[PDB]
Amino acid sequence: GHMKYPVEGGGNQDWWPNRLNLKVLHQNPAVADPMGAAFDYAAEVATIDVDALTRDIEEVMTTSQPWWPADYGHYGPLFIRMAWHAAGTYRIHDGRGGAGGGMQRFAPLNSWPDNASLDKARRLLWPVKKKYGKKLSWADLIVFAGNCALESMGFKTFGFGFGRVDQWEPDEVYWGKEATWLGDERYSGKRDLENPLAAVQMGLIYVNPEGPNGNPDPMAAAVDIRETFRRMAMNDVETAALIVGGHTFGKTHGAGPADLVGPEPEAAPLEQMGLGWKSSYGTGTGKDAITSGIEVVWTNTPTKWDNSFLEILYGYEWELTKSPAGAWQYTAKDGAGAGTIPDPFGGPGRSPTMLATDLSLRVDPIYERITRRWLEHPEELADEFAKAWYKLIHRDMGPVARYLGPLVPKQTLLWQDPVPAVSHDLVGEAEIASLKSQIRASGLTVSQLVSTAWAAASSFRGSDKRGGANGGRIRLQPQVGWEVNDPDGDLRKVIRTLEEIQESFNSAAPGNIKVSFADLVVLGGCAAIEKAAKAAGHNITVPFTPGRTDASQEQTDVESFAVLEPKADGFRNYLGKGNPLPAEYMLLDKANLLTLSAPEMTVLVGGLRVLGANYKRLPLGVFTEASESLTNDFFVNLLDMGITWEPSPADDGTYQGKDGSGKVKWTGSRVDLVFGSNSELRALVEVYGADDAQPKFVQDFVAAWDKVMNLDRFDVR
């Protein structure tokens, strides 16, 4: 190999290929954001004229463009494939992917094989982004072009939510190890797909449309449809609703050989202006379009909503054939329905065709039972496509407070993890003071208060903005019984105590003030950090924002919440079994999911350790001789060159630090030691380990802790 200029990719990653990459803790840095620091997209969208945006979109859908003429003179279908592919990268394991950041316009997703032709699809909406400017993000516009497409073609959607903030540097997500497009190195066992992935091959949204590995077997393809969709929050009924209702519109494109198709956008020459997949077949567009290489037209009304798709799937029998590019697809046997399917540009009619994956809705017994009922009762299909399409293009929006606009329905949806609305006067500065003191007298230790508070709030992840302390769910299933949160039972004693305090406060309160459990969980950790700063000779108040309310078990989807459990949390020195990488990489990934910077991550580790927040209260990293005191001792001792460190003899992932006498003074994990070893983190430890650093250490730790307690509080922003 050869080392390159940094402007062409070079860097220290090339000299130490598996080195921690701290650039994950500064994604989308403000230096790259062209908008001012005072710019609030939510404020812009709140003033947008929806009825004008809609018409300008319908005006775009029905005005063909010579560089990509419109099938049946309507782009609606194409925009549905666009919105579905923007949302369709979402995966449940890490919450990443999805439409919430508009990431389909940047690499690598803009160049994914399955996003072929969507480069053109987005281009067609620039006239729309231009008329509306800073009031409309690309993220909102992309997904809204589909919801407008549906309504325009006969399907009344459930509603819509604006508020997706545009970004400027693509989020980096691990999409698989395969270095080859459409590669498959992601299965083991009996068809067990590698977590966190949610697609069968590198570059696909979900499944191969020619069946597994290209084997056009409907019954097997359905195993993949079932499972990739599951990993995208869709059950059997939602998946069938989605596939059916989607293919009620539009058509495939495979008019000619696929080896006539040029390089993907990110690899294209300059003169193409961001567009890729340029084809020398015929016009290279329109009647000669080559997208997937398949050539199917599911319905006889490609631009209206009706029950044609299932009528057709069930009213013919199907045999296997080749498209003009040689891809597998099915056709109606015995020349049935010849000439019955309309042409994208006026040519002769054609005869019905389906994909392998479409036959799976009839051949699979679960899906047969679902689709046959909709054949006989199509109105059930409308209701389920409404719900599933809503879920799909909103799944990563986070709490409802974040949904803006006049088309936002008012109904509770379990998959949003609802939280009740405030019912009483929120707790003021005088009651917050009283409660910090009541909690400090309750008998709960500093460690109990800070662990519970952290466990509740750190359940947030910024990929999809699920999780967090609002809801009160640390006392509901499944969070009460996550291994990290409750090794030996202390958690339910804390819960018990905090509920007595809330009850007695609420029955004595002045007037109509009431505190929720969810708030007292957070308030308690703020109360302990104050007490523990005082013990170190710092008088400081920890901020606190009331407003959380208490969700109920019935309002908490236990299985949906399953993906949020930490298999590893380095802030509590917790390392469960089965993580993809060593503990220090997981630490950074957890730091990334909490939207934390390296300085913020560094300060919270050191504080949490001396506060006793360690899982099982283990001594790993607890480099202090004070109890329940918020000092910067973690940083000072990490830098003590009078300690010698070796891997512990029991090969237990711990380290032994010996002082001059050869006696063991400290013990540590890989997560602790990486702060003294990694030359960027050690730099940060030298900041907080200096003699003049303890007041700054305390202030910056309070700020980082307050930032974690508020991660889901979009109700106050």
Q: Which residues are catalytic?
A: 85
Q: What is the CA radius of gyration of the chain?
A: 28
Positions in 77-116 near ligand HEM (CB under 6 A) = 77-78, 80-81, 84
Spatial contact of 457 and 709, defined as CB atoms under 8 Å apart = yes
695 binds a second copy (CB under 8 A): no
Interface pick for ligand HEM out of 251, 531, 548, 590 (rule CB under 6 A): 251
129 binds a second copy (CB under 8 A): yes
Instruction: Extract the tokens encoding 147.
Output: 């919801």
Residue placing its CB nearer to ligand HEM in the complex, 325 or 698: 325
Minimum Å gap between C-beta 244 and a second copy is 34
Minimum Å gap between C-beta 122 and a second copy is 10
Minimum Å gap between C-beta 251 and ligand HEM is 5
Pick from a second copy, ligand HEM, none: which does 412 bind, CB < 5 to 8 A by kind? none
Spatial contact of 635 and 685, defined as CB atoms under 8 Å apart = yes
Binding-site residues, in ranges, read 247
Peptide bond into 196 cis (omega under 30): yes
Interface pick for ligand HEM out of 99, 136, 225, 596 (rule CB under 6 A): 225
Pick from a second copy, ligand HEM, none: which does 679 bind, CB < 5 to 8 A by kind? a second copy
What is the rounded CA–CA span in Å between residue 313 and residue 456? Answer: 49
What is the rounded CA–CA span in Å between residue 517 and residue 301? Answer: 54
Q: What is the bridge-based pairing of β-strands 664-669 and 654-658?
A: antiparallel
Task: State whether residue 448 is helix, strand or coil.
Answer: helix
Binding-site residues for heme b, in ranges, read 247
What is the rounded CA–CA span in Å between residue 474 and residue 457? Answer: 9
Interface pick for a second copy out of 267, 320, 430, 441 (rule CB under 8 A): 267
Residue numbers after which the chain is interrupted (C to N above 2.5 A) read none
Interface pick for a second copy out of 384, 490, 700, 712 (rule CB under 8 A): 700
Pick from ligand HEM, a second copy, none: which does 251 bind, CB < 5 to 8 A by kind? ligand HEM
243 binds ligand HEM (CB under 6 A): yes
Q: Kindly write out the interface string for residues 277-316 of this chain, putting x where it contacts a second copy by CB under 8 A and - elsewhere.
A: ----------------------------------------
Query: Which among 83, 75, 82, 78 has a CA at the least distance from the CA of 58?
Result: 75
562 binds a second copy (CB under 8 A): no
357 binds ligand HEM (CB under 6 A): yes
What is the rounded CA–CA span in Å between residue 630 and residue 607? Answer: 6
Minimum Å gap between C-beta 519 and a second copy is 29
Interface pick for ligand HEM out of 41, 206, 318, 688 (rule CB under 6 A): 206
Task: State whether residue 162 is helix, strand or coil.
Answer: strand
Instruction: Extract the tokens encoding 422.
Output: 């405030």
Which DSSP string corresponds to 62-128?
A: TS--TTSPPGGG--HHHHHHHHHHHHTT--TTT---SSTT-GGGSTTGGG-GGGTTHHHHHHTTHHH
231 binds ligand HEM (CB under 6 A): no
Spatial contact of 210 and 328, defined as CB atoms under 8 Å apart = yes
14 binds a second copy (CB under 8 A): yes
Pick from ligand HEM, a second copy, none: which does 693 bind, CB < 5 to 8 A by kind? a second copy
Positions in 22-61 near a second copy (CB under 8 A) = 22-26, 29-35
What is the rounded CA–CA span in Å between residue 708 and residue 711? Answer: 5
* Residue that is written with structure tokens 């879920």 in the block: 391
Pick from a second copy, ligand HEM, none: which does 84 bind, CB < 5 to 8 A by kind? ligand HEM
Edge-first strand listing for the sheet containing 654-658: 644-647, 654-658, 664-669
Considering only the stretches 39-47, 62-70, 72-80, 677-685, report the one whose residues sit in contact with ligand HEM under the rule CB under 6 A: 72-80
Positions in 672-691 near a second copy (CB under 8 A) = 673-674, 676-680, 682-684, 686-691
Q: Kindly write out the interface string for residues 265-304 of this chain, putting x where it contacts ligand HEM by CB under 6 A and - elsewhere.
A: --------------------------xx-x----------
Query: Which among 467, 410, 394, 419 has a CA at the least distance from the CA of 163?
Result: 394
499 residue type, one letter: E
User: Where on the chain is the footprint of ligand HEM (CB under 6 A)?
Assistant: 71, 77-78, 80-81, 84, 206-207, 209, 225, 242-243, 245-247, 249-254, 291-292, 294, 355, 357
